Amino acid sequence: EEKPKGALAVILVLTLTILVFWLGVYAVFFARG
Amino acid sequence: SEISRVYEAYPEKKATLYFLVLGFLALIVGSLFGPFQALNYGNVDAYPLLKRLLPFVQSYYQGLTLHGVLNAIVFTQLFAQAIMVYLPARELNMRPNMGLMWLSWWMAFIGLVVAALPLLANEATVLYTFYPPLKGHWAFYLGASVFVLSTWVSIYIVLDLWRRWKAANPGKVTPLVTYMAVVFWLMWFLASLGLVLEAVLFLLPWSFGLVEGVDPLVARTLFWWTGHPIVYFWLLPAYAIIYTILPKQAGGRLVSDPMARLAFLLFLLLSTPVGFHHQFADPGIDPTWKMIHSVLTLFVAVPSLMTAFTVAASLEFAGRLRGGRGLFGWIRALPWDNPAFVAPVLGLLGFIPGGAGGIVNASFTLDYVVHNTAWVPGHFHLQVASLVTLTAMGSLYWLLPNLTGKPISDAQRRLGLAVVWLWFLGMMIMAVGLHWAGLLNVPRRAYIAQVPDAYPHAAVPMVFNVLAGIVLLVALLLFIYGLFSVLLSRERKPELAEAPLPFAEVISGPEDRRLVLAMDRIGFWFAVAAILVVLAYGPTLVQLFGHLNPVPGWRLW
Amino acid sequence: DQHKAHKAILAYEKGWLAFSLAMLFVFIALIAYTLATHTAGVIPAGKLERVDPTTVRQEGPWADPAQAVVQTGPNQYTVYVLAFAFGYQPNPIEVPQGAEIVFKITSPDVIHGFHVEGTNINVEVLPGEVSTVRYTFKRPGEYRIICNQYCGLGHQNMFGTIVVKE
Ligand code: HAS
Ligand code: HEM
Ligand SMILES: CCCCCCCCCO[C@@H]1O[C@H](CO)[C@@H](O)[C@H](O)[C@H]1O
Ligand code: CUA
Ligand SMILES: [Cu+]
Numbered sequence: 001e002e003k004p005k006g007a008l009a010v011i012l013v014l015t016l017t018i019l020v021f022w023l024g025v026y027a028v029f030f031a032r033g
Numbered sequence: 034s035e036i037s038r039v040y041e042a043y044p045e046k047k048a049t050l051y052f053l054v055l056g057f058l059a060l061i062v063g064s065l066f067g068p069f070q071a072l073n074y075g076n077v078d079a080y081p082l083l084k085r086l087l088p089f090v091q092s093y094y095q096g097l098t099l100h101g102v103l104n105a106i107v108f109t110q111l112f113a114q115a116i117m118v119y120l121p122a123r124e125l126n127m128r129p130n131m132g133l134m135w136l137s138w139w140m141a142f143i144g145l146v147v148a149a150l151p152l153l154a155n156e157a158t159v160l161y162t163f164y165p166p167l168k169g170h171w172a173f174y175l176g177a178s179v180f181v182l183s184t185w186v187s188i189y190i191v192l193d194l195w196r197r198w199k200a201a202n203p204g205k206v207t208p209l210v211t212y213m214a215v216v217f218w219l220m221w222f223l224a225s226l227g228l229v230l231e232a233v234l235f236l237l238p239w240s241f242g243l244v245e246g247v248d249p250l251v252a253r254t255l256f257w258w259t260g261h262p263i264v265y266f267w268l269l270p271a272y273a274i275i276y277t278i279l280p281k282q283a284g285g286r287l288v289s290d291p292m293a294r295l296a297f298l299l300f301l302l303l304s305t306p307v308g309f310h311h312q313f314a315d316p317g318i319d320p321t322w323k324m325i326h327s328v329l330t331l332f333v334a335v336p337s338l339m340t341a342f343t344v345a346a347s348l349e350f351a352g353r354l355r356g357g358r359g360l361f362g363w364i365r366a367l368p369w370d371n372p373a374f375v376a377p378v379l380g381l382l383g384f385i386p387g388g389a390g391g392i393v394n395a396s397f398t399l400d401y402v403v404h405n406t407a408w409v410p411g412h413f414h415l416q417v418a419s420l421v422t423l424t425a426m427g428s429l430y431w432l433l434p435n436l437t438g439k440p441i442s443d444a445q446r447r448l449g450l451a452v453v454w455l456w457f458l459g460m461m462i463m464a465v466g467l468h469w470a471g472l473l474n475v476p477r478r479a480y481i482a483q484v485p486d487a488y489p490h491a492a493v494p495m496v497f498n499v500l501a502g503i504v505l506l507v508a509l510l511l512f513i514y515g516l517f518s519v520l521l522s523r524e525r526k527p528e529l530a531e532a533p534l535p536f537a538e539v540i541s542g543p544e545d546r547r548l549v550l551a552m553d554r555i556g557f558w559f560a561v562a563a564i565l566v567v568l569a570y571g572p573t574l575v576q577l578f579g580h581l582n583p584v585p586g587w588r589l590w
Numbered sequence: 591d592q593h594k595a596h597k598a599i600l601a602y603e604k605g606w607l608a609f610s611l612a613m614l615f616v617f618i619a620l621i622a623y624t625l626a627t628h629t630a631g632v633i634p635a636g637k638l639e640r641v642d643p644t645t646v647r648q649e650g651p652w653a654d655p656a657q658a659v660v661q662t663g664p665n666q667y668t669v670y671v672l673a674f675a676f677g678y679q680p681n682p683i684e685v686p687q688g689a690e691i692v693f694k695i696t697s698p699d700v701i702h703g704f705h706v707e708g709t710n711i712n713v714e715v716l717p718g719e720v721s722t723v724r725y726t727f728k729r730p731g732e733y734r735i736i737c738n739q740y741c742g743l744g745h746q747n748m749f750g751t752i753v754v755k756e
Contacts, residue, residue: 004595010345017386018613025396025402033628094740160740167740250719291600315721316716319636339606397621401632478745540595542596542600582640583718585643587699587700
């Protein structure tokens with residue numbers, strides 16, 4: 001019936017999770033470089 | 034030798050539940066070795082208890098080799114040959130070559146048997162990746178080799194009853210499940226090339242007696258050809274059930290069938306040309322080929338990113354339809370009492386950290402931080418041991434009555450739903466401990482419990498691996514007890530045995546024709562799929578096959 | 591509701607693809623930024639380099655471990671390392687801080703891992719080929735070497751040492 005607002009919240013969770021894994025392991029990498 | 038007329042007009046119903054029970058058998062004895070591996074990664078040596086309880090087990094490494102092969106290689110291929118033949122089957126109301134869908138099961142069976150024996154008796158304890166120089170019985174590299182080729186029987190069967198159906202139906206675009214199935218099976222043909230090349234060309238001459246050595250760079254630059262798309266091989270039967278059967282177990286509709294094609298299409302194009310992502314730390318492969326391969330892997334992720342919106346969009350629409358309320362009412366609206374629902378939905382949740390982990394592994398230089406640590410089995414338990422394994426488990430509770438009358442009881446429903454939740458919670462706890470452990474440098478494939486003093490900094494994720502070990506036994510035990518209980522009742526009621534496979538309607542839109550039509554040029558997309566393979570693998574596999582430096586195989590076990 | 595939850599769901603579909611390609615492309619720009627800095631140095635050398643695994647202790651640069659450390663530059667030392675069933679050679683490996691250490695590893699038996707705890711050096715070691723990685727330690731100390739690739743029953747015990755001289 002409108003904004004599939006809920007599905008938007010799930011891909012937002014996915015996005016934040018992809019971001020913190022990536023950015024987390026990206027710093028660890030320079031720390032050992 | 035057939036009968037109860039359900040099994041008469043559809044005897045592939047039989048050819049399905051045999052695959053689907055050898056595949057479960059293999060999963061049982063594999064997953065036994067599992068909680069023993071967790072206790073280990075939580076510094077607890079429970080292998081005295083194993084060698085008493087299965088005195089045939091020699092090393093920690095024997096069982097991991099069983100854990101690997103029976104779970105990732107064997108459980109999954111059979112669940113794949115179940116769902117991905119029998120689906121374009123029930124949809125099309127046609128009968129797969131009833132003879133050829135039996136050169137499959139036997140073929141796979143004795144192929145499994147011929148590999149099982151030397152493993153069972155310490156003769157090929159080379160882990161599920163058999164990287165030369167480690168070498169094992171002729172019978173291993175024979176058995177698993179015959180076993181994989183069983184799929185080539187599946188590709189034909191299905192392409193066949195596709196190209197049949199096509200003829201009887203001119204102008205009419207390919208059905209959803211069958212379309213899935215056709216790009217699936219095509220992608221896997223184009224992918225089995227590696228593991229068969231390496232088997233014929235190196236592993237079998239080498240292991241029978243006819244050469245004294247294999248080149249490791251190429252045996253492995255070939256193994257991964259296949260090694261990668263094979264996980265997308267284990268994934269898509271579950272994506273099958275989730276795009277086409279789960280919206281209706283939910284009370285809904287698959288909201289866009291064009292998207293649920295575009296995903297599969299995209300797996301056809303990009304699952305095979307990626308293997309260097311497993312070779313980032315190998316010598317004698319160019320940084321630019323690793324880089325073209327990196328960027329390509331970051332693309333094999335787009336269809337899963339999309340799979341995420343489409344499946345959520347869908348569960349949410351089902352949820353609103355049953356009175357789910359604000360931003361989150363729709364989760365609470367869904368049928369949290371049907372394990373066939375709960376099972377793959379919990380797996381999808383664990384899939385969010387799994388894919389994130391995947392996107393790091395892919396990112397070329399970042400693989401240096403976590404390659405060959407415990408981070409990797411952390412990543413793939415969230416993917417194959419949680420999502421993929423769980424969908425299947427929960428698809429005993431709608432696919433099983435639909436293959437032998439025996440219905441599901443309210444004793445069984447409430448044990449199917451406690452099994453599923455413990456195996457999900459088990460997996461999550463193992464995810465933390467394994468990811469955190471890798472980041473602290475703990476290697477993978479290692480009996481670390483024998484060196485109980487070497488990883489002091491891993492103290493607290495080690496407590497997590499122990500908890501996760503206990504919990505997956507309590508779930509592995511309830512699931513064994515469970516799997517017998519269902520398909521060891523008298524019970525055979527043949528009515529819900531013809532209740533037709535509970536697919537889903539498909540909110541059809543106007544945009545459908547230009548789009549769908551475009552992606553139905555199967556033959557052409559299959560030509561792009563095998564040109565990407567030639568562009569990605571050729572300049573290396575050939576500055577390689579003309580530099581072979583083969584080496585004596587060693588047995589260190 | 592129902593066919594208007596198809597009008598909305600396929601345009602969001604369009605927006606989410608946009609966003610995601612945008613995101614995967616930042617990851618390509620950032621991976622690519624690493625791909626030329628000193629940190630890039632750990633990527634195995636591209637070039638092939640064949641050797642005979644069974645002759646390898648009985649002649650060549652990996653044959654007497656006291657010769658493993660050989661200067662090959664004004665501010666650069668090459669360490670021929672050999673990695674084998676259930677240990678490393680030399681042990682310890684002594685190298686000075688600030689220096690480019692070009693590590694050149696290989697194996698007389700089965701494939702091995704070479705993962706220097708504390709650093710990005712994480713590289714596979716194949717019998718018959720030479721991995722050439724490349725690193726500059728910025729802190730003196732001892733670093734453990736872990737084999738992170740299964741090589742038979744010795745595996746969990748296979749470890750080395752690198753001392754980097756103050
Ligand atoms: C079944 C299995 C597997 C899948 C699927 C899988 C996916 C990926 N993998 Fe992987 N993997 C790698 C990269 C990826 C990438 C980029 C993806 C991508 O395909 C992942 C994309 C996934 C997503 C983008 C997630 C989307 C989330 C969804 C779709 C669920 C949403 C929730 C919903 C919809 C509903 C919620 C419900 C409510 C009620 C709200 C790399 C490197 O680039 C390595 C080598 C690393 C190394 O050093 O060894 C690697 C190593 C492995 C190994 C080790 C092999 C060995 O033993 O050496 C295995 C077994 C494995 C399995 C699998 N892997 N992988
Ligand atoms: C009770 C259930 C399970 C538990 C506790 C478990 C636990 C583990 C652990 C701790 C490891 C790492 C051991 C090591 O690296 O030394 C492992 C490896 C593995 N598991 Fe599981 N697992 C389970 C089920 C599964 C399932 C269902 C699959 C099915 C597709 C699977 C596929 C694998 C594979 C391929 C490996 C890699 C072994 C290797 O590196 O050769 N596992 N498992
Ligand atoms: C689901 C993931 C759970 C994550 C738990 C937090 C772990 C923090 C990682 O620590 C890292 O470990 C190494 C120490 O040896 C160093 O190389 C690195 O510099 C350091 O910062
Ligand atoms: Cu050398 Cu494990
Ligand atoms: Cu892969």
